[PDB]
Amino acid sequence: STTITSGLKYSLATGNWGEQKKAMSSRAGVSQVLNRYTYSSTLSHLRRT
Amino acid sequence: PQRLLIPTVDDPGIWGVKVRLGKEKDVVRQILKKKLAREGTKNPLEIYSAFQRDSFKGHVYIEARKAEAINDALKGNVNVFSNNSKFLVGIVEYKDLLRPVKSSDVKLTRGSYVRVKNGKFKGDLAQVDEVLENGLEARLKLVPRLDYGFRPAQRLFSEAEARVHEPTIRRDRDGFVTYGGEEYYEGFLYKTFRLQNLIVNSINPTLNELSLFQSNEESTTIDLSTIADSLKETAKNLVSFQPGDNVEIINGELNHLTGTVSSVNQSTIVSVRLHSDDDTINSETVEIPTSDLRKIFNVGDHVRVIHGKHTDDTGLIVEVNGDKVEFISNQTKRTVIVFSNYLIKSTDSTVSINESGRFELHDLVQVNSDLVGIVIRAQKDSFDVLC
């Protein structure tokens, strides 16, 4: 059960979308820390491409 | 015979295949079982032999004649990697793949003096009283390390002190005493130790332990053959050469010739330019093995001790008595006689005294109950104090 759990948690925590041992060549920045400076900034961050 | 059995061109070929580490013997057993099971069938495993060697990790060698036979033998196995990592062994390698190993010494000799790898007597010199026929263990003669009720210093087992501190001593014979489950024979412990607990080469003996062991033999160090061999080993291994060293040749057609080391390659080939009355000979460089070179030490040269009690001591050569050379020391300012094997011509001392003693330079120390001084110069053996 640790495989899927650790993989999902790592990819969501660091933003590298892939396996942990293939961090290079993986698409980075997919997951980001939510911007909570003000309400409008959070709303803008949740609708970003 | 043995020589006639060397392989020919028509002999069966040998293939090597990479496998997962630690599964080589498992693959060998699986191959043998498959061959036995398919033996006597319509499609028997058309191979001849298969084996592996411990040193050649990850390789299993099969003697056969066809690549399809190798594929059939490897078919149905999981330790074989995905790719067909098979290669044709050269015929010359056939003898080397099966040549024996660890043939340096015939056996451990009873009565020899050895060092202990681990245990409570880790590093203590021990005599091999008995060699077990299994070869994995051996009964040894040691100096006991007991407190009688972090290890106590080695000391001959004293029956009176042992009884005073522990009156439960046992007796089985005359001179053979068992105390605390340990068998001591005439004051020396006799305990079996595994082969993995002993060093049988590069053994460094001390005269203190030698005397403590040979005192019961009614003569101080009567046995000196293994000791002489150890001396030869220490003399041979301790020699290290540098360019410009004046050396003399012991063997070969060029025996009793002097020369200067020009360049050093690896640790066994030394290029030397020889010196002689003929000019045309002095302009030639000869590469000579180090095993037939002896250093030449001229009187009045700065020399530094390589190894021994006088390690890092320097001085000027005064008397050259062949093997043993005498030189006036620099720190103690007294003559010291050390073998030429322990001297290197080092024109500059620049001795560092760090990591030695308790005091450094410029330390205000108390000489005695009345005199107090400061350190001006430190030595490997003493200190110089201005009071």
């Binding site: - | 024109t347 500059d348 620049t350 560092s352 330079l361 410029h362």
Partner: protein, 93 residues
């Protein structure tokens, strides 16, 4: 104090300010070089007042330099790659 600031200081012509910025206000270091081999292999012991280059076997022809610590590190890394940068305090032509 990046490269563009260094170029501006060169344009102003202030060599002393540039030297002070890059040495005194930063990693300044003192090394000893053999006067023969030119390498930073001198085993200097200041308290005992003895200097010695083992390769050349000399005790006298030895000088000291003030160079940035990064320069010392660069020369040592070059020596780690079998390249020998030799620093000499006199020209030869």
């Amino acid at each position: 104090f990046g490269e563009m600031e260094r170029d501006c200081m060169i344009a102003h012509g202030a060599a002393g300010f540039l030297k002070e910025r890059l040495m005194e206000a930063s990693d300044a270091f003192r090394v000893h070089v053999c006067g023969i081999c030119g390498l930073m292999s001198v085993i200097a012991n200041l308290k005992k007042n003895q200097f010695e280059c083992r390769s050349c076997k000399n005790k006298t022809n030895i000088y000291q330099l003030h160079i940035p610590y990064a320069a010392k590190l660069l020369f040592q890394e070059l020596m780690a790659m079998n390249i020998a940068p030799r620093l000499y305090t006199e020209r030869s032509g």
